[PDB]
Design a binder for this molecule. Structure first.
Ligand SMILES: CC(C)(C)NC(=O)NC1CCN(C(=O)[C@H](Cc2cccc(C(=N)N)c2)NS(=O)(=O)c2cccc(-c3ccc(CO)c(F)c3)c2)CC1
Ligand SMILES: [Ca+2]
Length: 223
């Protein structure tokens, strides 16, 4: 997260870190057994880390749980990042508490101008590299689809939306992928991609979760 603020420990209790020896992507807890992340974060050997603030220090509220199965969206395209969503099942159910909590799925999509909370452990620099140990947060509005497509001609599908600031300076970044965009109490987005980070006229692009609620519900009921 570039241009954000330190969230405060466990203030985003649905945020998870995906770990394969090191943090490599975010995710969001959607019930005690299931996490939703970005398909481009897929790999084998995932450990889900819940209850985290400082990802380099054991602070006493963590749960570490191996994935038992991953399900990438059937229509995910790795060239274009269309349908950049996957589901991860936990080998054992998380113990839900004030620091380890699920986030509700949308029942409707959100509108341009609505303010959202975006979070993660990704790079904090728009030029260069600095990785934080504690969770970072950013408040940012959904942008109109026309401004999104104007920024990224030929690249935006109906399964994507832009959020952020066209002037630059405030954005998600490398290592935030897979993590949450929460608007009015609902998981509306997954951190997916952008051209650089926090650059002028290059806002963040997010998977449009509201298009996937039926697939999520049916997939988790059958697995
Ligand atoms: C290795 C594997 C095959 C799994 N792919 C993978 O890991 N991809 C991730 C995809 C997501 N990535 C990025 O977009 C990165 C960092 C980043 C991450 C999240 C949000 C933001 C932001 N600014 N909010 C920025 N930005 S980047 O360095 O410019 C870069 C490097 C390579 C590729 C594309 C890119 C751009 C556009 C499209 C779609 O048209 C695209 F498909 C890719 C951008 C990391 C890299
Ligand atoms: Ca920790």
């Amino acid at each position: 997260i570039v241009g954000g603020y330190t969230c405060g420990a466990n203030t985003v209790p649905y945020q998870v870190s995906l770990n394969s020896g090191y943090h490599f992507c975010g995710g969001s807890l959607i019930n005690s057994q299931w996490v939703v992340s970005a398909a481009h974060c897929y790999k084998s050997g995932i450990q889900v880390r819940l209850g985290e603030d400082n990802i380099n220090v054991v602070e006493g509220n963590e749960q570490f749980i191996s994935a038992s199965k991953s399900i990438v969206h059937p229509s995910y395209n790795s060239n274009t990042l269309n349908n950049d969503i996957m589901l991860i099942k936990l080998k054992s159910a998380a113990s839900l508490n004030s620091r380890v909590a699920s986030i509700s799925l949308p029942t409707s999509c959100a509108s341009a101008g609505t303010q959202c909370l975006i979070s993660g452990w990704g790079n904090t620099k728009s030029s260069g590299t600095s990785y934080p140990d504690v969770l970072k947060c950013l408040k940012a509005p959904i942008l109109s689809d026309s401004s999104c497509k104007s920024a990224y001609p030929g690249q935006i599908t109906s399964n994507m939306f832009c959020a952020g600031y066209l002037e630059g300076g405030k954005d998600s970044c490398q290592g935030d992928s897979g993590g949450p965009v929460v608007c009015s109490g609902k998981l509306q987005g997954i951190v997916s991609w952008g051209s650089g980070c926090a650059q002028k006229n290059k806002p963040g692009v997010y998977t449009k979760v509201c298009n996937y609620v039926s697939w999520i519900k049916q997939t988790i009921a059958s697995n």
